[PDB]
């Protein structure tokens, strides 16, 4: 498999999974139908989203690395699957909410060849490749705000912070790509527990690297060796290259 | 006036606005174009949205109180416009920004007859009248949660709270119908300035009360006395009747 089957699968993917959600009324997608491999109960919303997904991806060579199903098939390229990201909001009819896939030649993401985002809502596409990331076709870089008095989605401000704005989504995948394309400043995710997971982070990271941005854990080391499993954790910073080491020290 | 033509109004604006928005392009939307009269920067999309909708109030026996031109007109009938709210979002292409209308008797809010509050992105159209709250033509009511661990909007968290999930949008009279509907179980703007203006909440505190909301100050007390004027700033803290009282705590 190549960055360009990658792009194929996806589109194919963010259409079925488009449609199955755009059938569904409101009060059918908020009922909580399973409990989910990952232990949070797969909505409706999930199921359908997920099933397309799947249809689609087990004609692959892959092992899938999804939320709702848990980790499915043997081949040697990885994929990691939020079949809906923001689900909440899907529910409610909030239009953040996305379906994320990413790639990766090994079960780490330093091996990691696409990502992709797909506003479910919307239909902004996000994408990245060896050629750079793109927002619905064109190519896209992140900002280079130099001052912590920025526009900042961080999860969770726990006390005051300089930033010029705070907001919060609720679609991680979604929101990295914001950060990606310059609409937002930076993306934190610091919360202690270490909530986010795989599939909720690996294609918004891989974007976001793409686009120019400088994407770590918590304490300023490398995601490279995140893994894809339904166990892996995750705290990011996010920022350009001058904002992030005062990004880091900030959260110290 | 009366609320049925509050209704025609709001929707001939709606048109108008949601028209202006869309033709204009992200990259002219995001200039800064003038200094307005509440001081902060006018962008060029809260101009051709304002314009659109002073183009059809002019026209009405009104004191309109807008955020980029300030008070304008003479008439007995109060209307406080956001005729943008979330204009951060609607620079960026994110799918959470509105016009917001609310009309009173009196230059006080407790005398409002009429609140309207449409998402120019998605096309949702909130409003209330003496029969209640609506969502799109239908009737719609706050969430009865009584636990603290909700879904809350709140600006900003500035400490570890309890809550099932948090979320800024960025578009307070757009999240102010999210909680009226049940999306979201409260609102909070407890930001220490007291940051908002009678425009960007008006619209949306009217329609959440009847929708079933209470809807108070920062230490509980009530709103009726706001002013329909540009010194007017406002702390909120809406809730169900159960849930309101144990949040008015909980923010000591
Ligand atoms: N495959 C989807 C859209 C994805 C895309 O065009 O990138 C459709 O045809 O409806
Ligand atoms: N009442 C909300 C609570 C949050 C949740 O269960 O996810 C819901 O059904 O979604
Ligand atoms: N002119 C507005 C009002 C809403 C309605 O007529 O239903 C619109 O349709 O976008
Ligand atoms: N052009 C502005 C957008 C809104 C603002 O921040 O005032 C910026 O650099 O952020
Ligand atoms: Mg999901
Ligand atoms: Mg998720
Ligand atoms: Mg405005
Ligand atoms: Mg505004």
Do not use: W
């Not at 848990?70 to 081949?75: A, W």
């Amino acid at each position: 498999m190549d960055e360009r089957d990658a792009l194929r699968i996806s589109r194919e993917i963010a259409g079925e999974v488009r449609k199955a959600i755009a059938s569904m009324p409101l009060r059918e997608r908020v009922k909580d139908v399973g409990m989910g491999k990952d232990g949070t109960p797969t909505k409706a919303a999930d199921r359908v989203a997920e099933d397309a997904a799947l249809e689609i991806l087990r004609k692959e060579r892959v092992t899938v690395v999804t939320e709702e199903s848990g980790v499915l098939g043997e081949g040697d390229v990885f994929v990691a699957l939020d079949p809906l990201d923001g689900t909440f909001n899907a529910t409610r009819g909030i239009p953040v909410y996305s379906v994320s896939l990413c790639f990766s030649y090994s079960d780490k993401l330093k091996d990691a060849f696409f990502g992709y985002v797909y506003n479910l809502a919307t239909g902004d596409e996000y994408y990245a490749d060896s050629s750079g990331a793109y927002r619905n076709g064109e190519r896209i870089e992140v900002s280079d705000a130099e001052e912590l008095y920025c526009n900042a989605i961080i999860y969770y401000p726990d006390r005051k912070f300089p930033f010029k704005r705070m907001r919060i989504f609720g679609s991680a995948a979604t929101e990295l790509c914001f950060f990606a394309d310059g609409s937002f400043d930076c993306f934190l995710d610091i919360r202690p527990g270490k909530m986010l997971r795989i599939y909720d982070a690996a294609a918004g990271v891989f974007i976001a690297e793409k686009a120019g941005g400088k994407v770590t854990e918590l304490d300023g080391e490398s995601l490279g060796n995140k893994k894809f499993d339904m166990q892996e954790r995750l705290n990011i910073v996010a920022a350009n290259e001058k904002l992030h080491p005062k990004l880091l020290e900030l959260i110290k």
